[PDB]
Write a protein that binds this ligand. Structure first.
Ligand SMILES: CCCCCCCCCCCCCCCCCC(=O)OC[C@H](COP(=O)([O-])OCC(O)COP(=O)([O-])OC[C@@H](COC(=O)CCCCCCCCCCCCCCCCC)OC(=O)CCCCCCCCCCCCCCCCC)OC(=O)CCCCCCCCCCCCCCCCC
Ligand SMILES: CCCCCCCCCCCCCCCCCC(=O)OC[C@H](COP(=O)([O-])OCC(O)COP(=O)([O-])OC[C@@H](COC(=O)CCCCCCCCCCCCCCCCC)OC(=O)CCCCCCCCCCCCCCCCC)OC(=O)CCCCCCCCCCCCCCCCC
Ligand SMILES: CCCCCCCCCCCCCCCCC[C@@H](O)O[C@H](CO[C@H](O)CCCCCCCCCCCCCCC)COP(=O)(O)OCC[N+](C)(C)C
Ligand SMILES: CCCCCCCCCCCCCCCCC[C@@H](O)O[C@H](CO[C@H](O)CCCCCCCCCCCCCCC)COP(=O)(O)OCC[N+](C)(C)C
Ligand SMILES: CCCCCCCC/C=C\CCCCCCCC(=O)O[C@H](COC(=O)CCCCCCC/C=C/CCCCCCCC)COP(=O)(O)OCCN
Lengths: 57, 459
């Protein structure tokens, strides 16, 4: 009493009910290095202008 | 200061929109007016300075040089009025533009509270001078003279830029006030020795020091009259002013790094004074006299004592005025003679008596006669060098004797004796030349009444 699968049936994506725990870190990766401080604030005019040689502005 | 810089700038549009036959009148009148405005700067105080703003400041060292610079331009215009008669309007306006640009650059240079701005204008003063020398020059050697004048200066002054930016990187500021207040001793090291050499050589080449003076006779001989006076009067003082400004950070290295330059100057004064005796040319003789006087100023600055600085400033102003007068007189002679040779025209005192009087007065002032400021600066430097070492008096006295000898030789060869027979175009002296000589000489005899105005900040 076996029914041959039709076209487009064996290529379906299916779901599997298993009791095996999901691996938490399969890549065996290390700890990611800390990112840069990426500081924030409100911009203020440059102190005493450009300060390039004799230029006062 | 802008009350001085702005009118000098406005002189350019004033000249360029003037009528074709009224440029000289307007330029002379407004240059004289500008000089009157510059007179206010002379009232210095015993305290720090007249700090006008963040960019310009005036001291009692900058005030006399600024007044002389502003005063020279009318005289340059009156001197150039003669040989530019047959020149097109555009070229005459370009000549006046070059003179005005030179004055503006010098005015901005002498205050220049920051050293990099000072250097920028100190090299900017080189383009109008080169254009004047190589364009409106008579002889065919003006090109070589211009090349020598450009390269001798630039080769010396190029390491100065590197030294200045290095100092800014380490010290953190190049403002002269901060530089003076935060000065620290220079340790005895090879790096500090080369910093000293870089900071000093740029100003010693322009003074000029003996051994690097080859550009000066060429530049003075081949240049037109106005270029000659602006070279002998103001452009030579740039090196000394810079050296007296910058020696504030080179201590105590100078205490033993001054020996080669002191020896070179104290021997080159004698050498050039002797050279003046055997000279076939007038302008060359005056140029070598300028070299001798500037060598004396170099000695004074390198001694680094208050009397040295006072004498150096007095000698700077006096030599500027005297050399300008002598070049004026030589040019007036050359215009009639068209030869520029000392012994070709003789006995001119019989034909031109008042010009003989002007020659006598100029020679006496150059001879360092008391109580003129020439001798004031001379004697101050002599006493300071005597304090430095008792043996310098021999060299200084020899220089004084040779100076008197060549000054009176210049007077006698051209004024006394029997007139040359085959010259019959010695026209009577114009009013312009007499007025030029009077305006050259009267400020000297007036400044001898108030010496404190030209004795510098260490008065
Ligand atoms: C005019 C109509 C509009 C109007 O009236 O506006 C008024 C307007 C009002 O502005 P303000 O903010 O109330 O004035 C603030 C104080 O003036 C002072 O304000 P500050 O100190 O904060 O800003 C000045 C500062 C910042 O300013 C700048 O960066 C600009 C630099 C020059 C400004 C030029 C303005 C006009 C140019 C005319 C042509 C000049 C030739 O300049 C510097 O840092 C020093 C630089 C000095 C020269 C640069 C180095 C190069 C040397 C060789 C130059 C040769 C150039 C090639 C040839 O003033 C002007 O526009 C007049 C001229 C500005 C002069 C002030 C700069 C002083 C230092 C250099 C003086 C050079 C003067 C040259 C002659 C100028 C003849 C007019
Ligand atoms: C001694 C004091 C006298 C005070 C009286 C007031 C005199 C005021 C004169 C102010 C400066 C003169 C302006 C220079 C150009 C002269 C204009 C001209 O072309 O003349 C033609 C004019 C008309 O003659 P012309 O026939 O138509 O022309 C034919 C030729 O020109 C042919 O001409 P020449 O053959 O007739 O010769 C022209 C004559 C005139 O030409 C000059 O050489 C005059 C310039 C002489 C100075 C040489 C430079 C040395 C540095 C001295 C700086 C002191 C200045 C003090 C303040 C001056 C204020 C402006 O040259 C000389 O006679 C030889 C002068 C050498 C004298 C050496 C002694 C100098 C030191 C004496 C002590 C000074 C301080 C005293 C301190 C202690 C006492 C209180 O003749 C005159 O005007 C002669 C003026 C008088 C001669 C003054 C010589 C000594 C005075 C120097 C300043 C006074 C000091 C204050 C003391 C008061 C007490
Ligand atoms: C019997 C009297 C004997 C003595 C006579 C002395 C006369 C002296 C005249 C010569 C003066 C020399 C020029 C001085 C210029 C420097 C001062 C100048 O910059 O000051 C300006 C002011 O200058 C004057 O306003 C204008 C003077 C210009 C004219 C001087 C008189 C002679 C001019 C001759 C011109 C040609 C005459 C006509 C010919 C046909 C700006 O002043 P300011 O920075 O705000 O001041 C701030 C401080 N306050 C607030 C107290 C004032
Ligand atoms: C030509 C027209 C004029 C142009 C300008 C002339 C001025 C340039 C002259 C340079 C001034 C002096 C330079 C060096 C001075 C330092 C003192 C030194 O020379 O004396 C001895 C130095 O010994 C030897 O001199 C070493 C240097 C030898 C190599 C230098 C070249 C010498 C001849 C080259 C002349 C060329 C000049 C013109 C170049 C174009 C002392 O030995 P020491 O106490 O242990 O070291 C002192 C320095 N310390 C303390 C920092 C360590
Ligand atoms: C009319 C012709 C005159 C020619 C004048 C040319 C000579 C001028 C004097 C030398 C110029 C170069 C000097 C460099 C500029 C100064 C910069 C400075 O002081 O920095 C020094 C660097 O010093 C140098 O690098 C000097 C190197 C010189 C290389 C170029 C040599 C040029 C010719 C040398 C001999 C000339 C001297 C006499 C000239 C007489 C005139 C002909 C400090 O080094 P740091 O890195 O900070 O070290 C600190 C940690 N220990």
């Amino acid at each position: 009493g076996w029914v041959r699968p039709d076209l487009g049936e064996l290529s379906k994506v299916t779901k599997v009910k298993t009791d095996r725990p999901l691996p938490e870190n399969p890549y065996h990766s290390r700890a990611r290095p800390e990112p840069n401080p990426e500081a924030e604030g409100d911009l203020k005019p440059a102190k005493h202008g450009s300060r390039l040689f004799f230029w006062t502005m | 200061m802008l009350k001085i810089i702005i009118p000098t700038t406005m002189l350019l549009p004033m000249t360029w929109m003037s009528k074709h036959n009224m440029i000289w009148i307007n330029a002379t009148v407004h240059s004289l007016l500008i000089s009157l405005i510059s007179l206010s700067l002379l009232n210095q105080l015993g305290e720090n300075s007249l700090n006008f703003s963040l960019t310009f400041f005036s001291d009692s060292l900058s005030a006399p040089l600024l007044v002389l610079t502003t005063w020279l331009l009318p005289l340059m215009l009156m001197a150039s009025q003669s040989h530019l008669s047959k020149e097109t309007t555009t070229r005459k306006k370009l000549y006046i533009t070059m003179l005005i640009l030179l004055q503006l650059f010098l005015i901005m240079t002498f205050t220049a509270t920051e050293l990099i701005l000072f250097y920028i204008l100190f090299e900017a003063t080189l383009v109008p001078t080169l254009i004047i020398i190589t364009r409106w020059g008579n002889q065919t050697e003006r090109l070589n003279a211009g090349l020598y004048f450009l390269f001798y200066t630039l080769a010396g002054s190029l390491p100065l830029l590197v030294a200045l930016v290095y100092i800014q990187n380490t010290t953190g500021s190049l403002n002269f006030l901060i530089i003076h207040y935060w000065s620290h001793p220079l340790s005895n090291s090879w790096s500090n020795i080369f910093m000293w050499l870089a900071c000093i050589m740029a100003f010693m080449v322009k003074m000029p020091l003996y051994g690097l003076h080859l550009w000066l006779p060429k530049a003075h001989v081949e240049a037109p009259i106005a270029g000659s006076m602006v070279l002998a009067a103001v452009l030579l003082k740039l090196g000394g002013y810079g050296m007296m400004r910058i020696t504030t950070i080179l201590n105590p290295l100078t205490n033993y790094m001054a020996y080669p330059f002191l020896m070179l100057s104290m021997w080159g004064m004698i050498m050039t004074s002797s050279i003046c005796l055997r000279q076939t040319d007038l302008k060359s003789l005056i140029a070598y006299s300028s070299v001798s006087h500037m060598a004396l100023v170099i000695v004074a600055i390198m001694i680094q004592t208050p009397w040295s600085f006072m004498g150096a400033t007095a000698l700077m102003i006096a030599h500027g005025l005297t050399s300008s007068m002598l070049f004026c007189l030589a040019n007036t002679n050359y215009e009639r003679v068209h030869s520029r040779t000392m012994i070709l025209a003789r006995g001119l005192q019989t034909l031109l008596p008042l010009m003989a009087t002007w020659w006598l007065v100029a020679s006496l002032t150059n001879l360092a006669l008391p109580p003129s400021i020439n001798l004031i600066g001379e004697l101050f430097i002599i006493t300071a060098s005597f304090s430095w070492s008792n043996i310098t008096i021999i060299l200084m006295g020899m220089n004084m004797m040779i100076t008197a000898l060549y000054s009176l030789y210049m007077l006698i060869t051209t004024q006394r004796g029997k007139y040359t027979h085959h010259i019959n175009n010695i026209k009577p002296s114009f009013t312009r030349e007499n007025a030029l000589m009077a305006l050259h000489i009267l400020p000297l005899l007036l400044l001898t009444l108030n010496p404190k105005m030209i004795l510098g900040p260490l008065y």
